Design a protein around this ligand. Structure first.
Ligand SMILES: Nc1ncnc2c1ncn2[C@@H]1O[C@H](COS(=O)(=O)NC(=O)[C@H](N)CS)[C@@H](O)[C@H]1O
Ligand SMILES: [Zn+2]
Length: 399
């Protein structure tokens, strides 16, 4: 699929430390050590409604990772899916009297427009679930052949399941106990009470055809993919075994990322699907609404960057006001004909961003330089432009 248009990205002088990030599996901050091409899969939208600030905050976090990797001289392969076949889409399609395909199309396009407005770097491979059925079917074939998967003994609805015990390491990605898992599974799309499963935690790989649902052919019967195997199959076929980062919101830690990793490790025999599992905090308004109101997308960025990415945080008009004020101050200081030398502040910004994306400290360092420049001035004629270029390249903020 078409992704969206990228902004210009300047080259920033100097060099900083390599990125380190919290890994949900290891439950600690660890070096991210990619090859020449760094690879990241970030779970995309289910396009039944508008981009809210939550989704935005999540893709903005991964935009920072992308930008820092470019700054370090890597090329990037960023893959992101669209879950364009899903129960909530069918529900909304029925409610509003819009074809489910048309709905997914419309909302994906609005997402594109929101991302481009926010100057988020687009993925290199943007893949709709409906375009990846062959890859899912191929993966499910392999899982059935190994005995990792089975077909439930239900003549009417021969659903295909992945065994929760297929991998010895199952559970390492979330660290959650079985009781916690069952509780989350029941809420997050799982079917713990479905008759005939070997284990309540077995995950649907292929939902047998139901009357009224779209379907695709397969060697194990007509139906449609389960959720986790879509992302597993897209990641494996676009990126392969050398996956640096699997990303998304913290709600995906379990079941989704757990099963996606387990499907892949089962098929490939690799110990670990992704080198880092990176999860954003949950935000508690639509991007397009704010834009329609004349809100500067750079203020949206700064507002969402004012807290650390792993923190759950609330959006409010206070957060917006603070972001608008910060944006105005940075614009003032970087419009100065001369200002103090920027070598240290650029170095600090790189240090803080490399330390598990410490945006609050980076923002504070930049505030500091701006206040100093505006209060005492300086003799570097180049520093204001260089600070503006640095904020553009690394934070995606357009001063
Ligand atoms: N309130 C929120 N705050 C921050 N991130 C969120 C929030 N709600 C959902 N997300 C994240 O934004 C995403 C897109 O969410 S979504 O539209 O519900 N889609 C899905 O969860 C997927 N289709 C995963 S394949 C994810 O990566 C998801 O974890
Ligand atoms: Zn996903």
């Amino acid at each position: 699929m078409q992704s969206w248009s990228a902004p210009a990205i300047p080259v920033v002088p100097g060099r900083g430390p390599a990125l380190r990030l919290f890994d949900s599996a290891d439950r600690q901050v660890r070096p991210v050590t990619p090859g020449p091409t760094a690879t990241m899969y970030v779970c995309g939208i289910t396009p039944y409604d508008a981009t809210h600030l939550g989704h935005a905050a999540t893709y903005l976090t991964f935009d920072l990772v992308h930008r820092l990797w470019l700054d370090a001289g890597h090329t990037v392969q960023y893959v992101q899916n669209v879950t364009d076949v899903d129960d909530p889409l069918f529900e909304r399609a029925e409610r509003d009297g819009i074809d489910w395909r048309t709905l997914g199309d419309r909302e994906t396009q609005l997402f594109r427009e929101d991302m481009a407005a926010l100057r988020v770097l687009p993925p290199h491979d943007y893949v709709a679930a409906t375009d990846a059925i062959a890859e899912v079917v191929e993966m499910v074939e392999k899982l059935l052949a190994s005995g990792a998967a089975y077909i439930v003994e239900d003549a009417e609805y021969p659903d295909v399941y992945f065994r929760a015990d297929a991998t010895a390491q199952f559970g390492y990605e979330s660290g959650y106990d079985r009781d916690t898992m069952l509780t989350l599974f029941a809420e997050r799309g799982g079917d713990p009470d479905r008759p005939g499963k070997s284990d309540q935690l077995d995950a649907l790989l292929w939902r047998a055809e139901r009357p009224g649902e779209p379907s695709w052919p397969s060697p194990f019967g007509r139906g449609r993919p389960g959720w986790h195997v879509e992302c597993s199959a897209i990641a494996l076929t676009r990126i392969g075994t050398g996956l640096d980062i699997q990303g998304g919101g913290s709600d995906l830690i379990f079941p989704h990322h757990e099963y996606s990793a387990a499907h892949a490790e089962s098929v490939t025999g690799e110990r670990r699907f992704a080198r880092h599992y990176v999860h954003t905090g949950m935000i508690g308004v639509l991007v397009s609404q704010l834009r329609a109101q004349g809100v500067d997308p750079s203020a949206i960025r700064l507002g969402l960057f004012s807290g650390h990415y792993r923190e759950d945080r609330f959006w409010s008009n206070e957060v917006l006001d603070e972001a608008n004020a910060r944006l105005a101050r940075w614009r003032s200081a970087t419009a100065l004909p001369e200002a103090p030398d920027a070598t240290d502040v650029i170095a600090r910004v790189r240090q803080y961003l490399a330390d598990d994306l410490d945006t609050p400290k980076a923002l504070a360092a930049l505030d500091g330089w701006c206040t100093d420049a505006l209060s005492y001035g300086g003799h570097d004629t180049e520093s204001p432009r260089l600070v503006a270029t640095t904020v553009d390249a690394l934070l995606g903020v357009d001063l």
